[PDB]
Design a protein around this motif. Structure first.
Motif, mmCIF file in Angstrom:
data_model
loop_
_atom_site.group_PDB
_atom_site.id
_atom_site.type_symbol
_atom_site.label_atom_id
_atom_site.label_comp_id
_atom_site.label_asym_id
_atom_site.label_seq_id
_atom_site.Cartn_x
_atom_site.Cartn_y
_atom_site.Cartn_z
ATOM 1 N N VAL B 49 0.984 -1.128 -0.067
ATOM 2 C CA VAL B 49 0.169 0.276 0.064
ATOM 3 C C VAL B 49 1.089 1.172 -0.003
ATOM 4 C CG1 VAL B 49 -1.850 1.327 1.208
ATOM 5 C CG2 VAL B 49 -1.708 -1.260 1.323
ATOM 6 N N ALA B 50 1.908 1.194 0.752
ATOM 7 C CA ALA B 50 2.842 2.174 0.952
ATOM 8 C C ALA B 50 3.774 2.414 -0.262
ATOM 9 C CB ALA B 50 4.076 1.909 1.912
ATOM 10 N N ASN B 51 4.114 1.419 -1.052
ATOM 11 C CA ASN B 51 4.913 1.600 -2.362
ATOM 12 C C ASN B 51 3.736 2.187 -3.317
ATOM 13 O OD1 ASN B 51 6.986 -1.068 -2.459
ATOM 14 N ND2 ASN B 51 7.212 0.963 -2.069
ATOM 15 N N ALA B 52 2.269 1.962 -3.024
ATOM 16 C CA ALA B 52 1.406 2.598 -3.976
ATOM 17 C C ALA B 52 1.281 4.222 -3.843
ATOM 18 C CB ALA B 52 -0.139 1.967 -3.605
ATOM 19 N N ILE B 53 1.564 4.661 -2.666
ATOM 20 C CA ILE B 53 1.453 5.878 -2.199
ATOM 21 C C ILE B 53 2.666 6.713 -3.104
ATOM 22 C CG2 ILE B 53 1.691 7.846 -0.427
ATOM 23 C CD1 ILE B 53 0.347 5.917 1.438
#
Lengths: 80, 112
Positions: B49-53
């Motif tokens: 999810v972090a990498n998506a941000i």
């Protein structure tokens, strides 16, 4: 901007470890001291000489100065 | 023995760098990563999810300066790189959570 315009370098690889993965002062006896000795040795006969020579000149000149302050008995041997 | 699945000896992670310099190459590549948890860990869901941000970019994204990714916007606004990607490569007992980017010699610093 001084980083990126310095030199044209090619084909050199370098490997480094984080400071936290390694020791600050490693191999004091197997590497450090030996080298300290090596470094001292390689310079001693280049630095020491003139300083030793200075010392001698200093000693002579200091003693030669005090000696000239003493009296020479050969100036009063016939002052009867 | 034949029907037992072998457990592999664990791999030690090391914070460190390797620099392969060749000024004759047109663009520089840089990848940076910290150790990941490994397949089984639920956190991998959050990491992704972090990498998506942060996301990714490349000079052909039309969104340009309006892309929601802050890093993407910056890369655009300041011509920071030709591209960049985040990743979360998992393995059984470990992994690599990081990012990789391609930039011109004189913008590596700002990008990083």
């Amino acid at each position: 901007i001084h980083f990126g315009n310095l030199a044209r370098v090619r084909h050199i690889i370098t490997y480094s470890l984080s400071p936290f993965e390694q020791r600050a002062i490693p191999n004091i006896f197997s590497d450090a001291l030996p080298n300290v000795w090596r470094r001292f040795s390689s310079q001693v006969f280049k630095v020491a000489p003139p300083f030793l020579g200075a010392y001698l000149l200093y000693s002579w000149g200091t003693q030669e100065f005090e000696r000239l302050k003493r009296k020479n008995p050969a100036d009063y041997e016939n002052d009867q | 023995k034949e029907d037992a699945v072998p457990i592999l000896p664990r791999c030690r992670f090391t914070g460190s760098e390797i620099r392969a310099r060749d000024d004759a190459l047109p663009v520089a590549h840089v990848a940076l990563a910290v150790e990941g948890p490994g397949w089984a860990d639920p956190d991998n869901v959050v990491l992704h999810v972090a990498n998506a941000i942060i996301g990714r970019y490349d000079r052909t994204f039309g969104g340009g300066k309006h892309l929601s990714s802050r890093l993407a916007a910056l890369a655009v606004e300041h011509k920071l790189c030709h591209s960049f990607q985040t990743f979360n490569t998992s393995y059984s007992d470990t992994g690599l959570f990081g990012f990789h980017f391609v930039a011109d010699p004189l913008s590596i610093d700002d990008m990083m």
